[PDB]
């Protein structure tokens, strides 16, 4: 019966290790450097083991993760970019070298991973209540005649 204005859907896959990090205001790489779920929020996150469809023996390089960042991404902040990351002194002119690693890294999946390393399809549904009329409503049956 609660009808809201807007809804946003995000979908991806991560490792089964970090499942506990998905919560409003957590400490960890995923909780800050990809998305931070706000401490107050309407909506939530659903995750389920999409291992056998998204894990390859040779390494499912199709699924990749943006890894490095100097800052924590705020709630409803989107950072999608393609830049090589500098850690020690220099970004090593866009190669693989001494202490110079690339954030957009493929996971290197293996279905031979244990239960902890079983990747999860992770989706977040986000509610937005704006001054506009709430049109994304739920059905109004109506009863019989």
């Amino acid at each position, epitope marked *: 019966d609660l009808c809201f204005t807007n809804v946003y859907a995000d979908s991806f896959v*991560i*490792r089964g*290790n*970090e499942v506990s*990090q998905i919560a409003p205001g957590q*400490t*960890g*790489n*995923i909780a*800050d450097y990809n998305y931070k779920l706000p401490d107050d929020f309407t909506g939530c996150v659903i995750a389920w083991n999409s291992n056998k469809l998204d894990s390859k023996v040779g390494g499912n390089y199709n699924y990749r*993760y943006r*890894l490095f960042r*100097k*800052s*924590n991404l705020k709630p409803f902040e989107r950072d999608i970019s393609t830049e090589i990351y*500098q*850690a*020690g*002194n220099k970004p090593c002119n866009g190669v693989a070298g*001494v202490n110079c*690693y690339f954030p957009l*890294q493929s*996971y290197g999946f293996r279905p*031979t*991973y*244990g*239960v*902890g*390393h079983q990747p999860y399809r992770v989706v977040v549904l986000s509610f937005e209540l704006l001054h506009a009329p709430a049109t994304v409503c739920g059905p109004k049956k109506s009863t019989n005649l």
Partner: single-chain antibody
């Protein structure tokens, strides 16, 4: 090279507050996380705490949670620890460790790539204290080393196997500690060679099993070797003390 100088140790009466410092030098410290680790005299390593390069990642030991404060400054390249309500079990040898960042989803990795000299803090002048709460952090199934203790002569090959209770993927660290001397890093990720490592030192790992081979032993290569894990609130292994037979 990175020089890590620690200060603040000595003998103190328990119960008051103390400050420990680790000053960093050698390169851009702002991009690297700093960490405290503990040494109980005559036994294995225990982790203390860790602070990220930006300070976003805060990690405290369960025993010291809620009473000890960490801080850092990337302009002067320093890490500070402020401790209160001291008890005699806190007497130890502390080490500050620089960041050795890794690349998987769970976050950055702080380990022993750049060492501090380690400083002794002895809060033992009054009566001893302890508690009856063991919890489950010390009873966890330790990564089994086969053999647990290996005493071999120079010249032959030594094999040490670290078998882990839970799946640690590829993140296991192989470490060397010279008795009375600054400990030395051996193997990143337990599977690839560290830079400048001679051919006689080799290691491999996948899942829960790791093998370390040291061919053609030398009289100076007897030390304490560690296989170390990093799942959540990372702890150290029991260590293997390889000395002369």
């Amino acid at each position: 090279e990175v020089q890590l100088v620690e200060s603040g140790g000595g003998l103190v009466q328990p119960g008051w507050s103390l400050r420990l410092s680790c000053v960093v030098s050698g390169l851009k410290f702002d991009d690297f996380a700093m960490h405290w680790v503990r040494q109980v005299p005559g036994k294995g390593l225990e982790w203390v705490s860790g602070l990220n390069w930006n300070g976003d990642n805060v990690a405290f030991a369960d025993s010291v949670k809620g009473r000890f404060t960490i801080s850092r400054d990337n302009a002067e390249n320093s890490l500070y620890l402020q401790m209160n309500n001291l008890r005699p079990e806190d007497t130890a040898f502390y080490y500050c460790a620089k960041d050795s960042y890794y690349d998987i989803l769970t976050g950055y990795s702080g380990a022993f790539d750049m060492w501090g000299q380690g400083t002794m803090v002895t809060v033992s002048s009054g009566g001893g204290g302890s508690g009856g709460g063991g919890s489950g952090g010390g009873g966890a199934i330790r990564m089994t080393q086969s053999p647990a203790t290996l005493s071999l002569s120079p010249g032959e090959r030594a094999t040490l196997s670290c078998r882990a209770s839970q799946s640690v993927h590829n993140y296991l660290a192989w470490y060397q500690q010279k008795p009375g001397q600054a400990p030395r890093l051996l193997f990143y990720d337990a599977s690839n060679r560290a830079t400048g490592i001679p051919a006689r030192f080799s290691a491999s790992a996948s899942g829960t099993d790791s093998t370390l081979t040291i061919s053609s032993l030398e009289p100076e290569d007897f030390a304490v070797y560690y296989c170390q894990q990093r799942r959540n609130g990372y702890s150290f292994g029991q260590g293997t003390k390889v000395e002369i037979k």
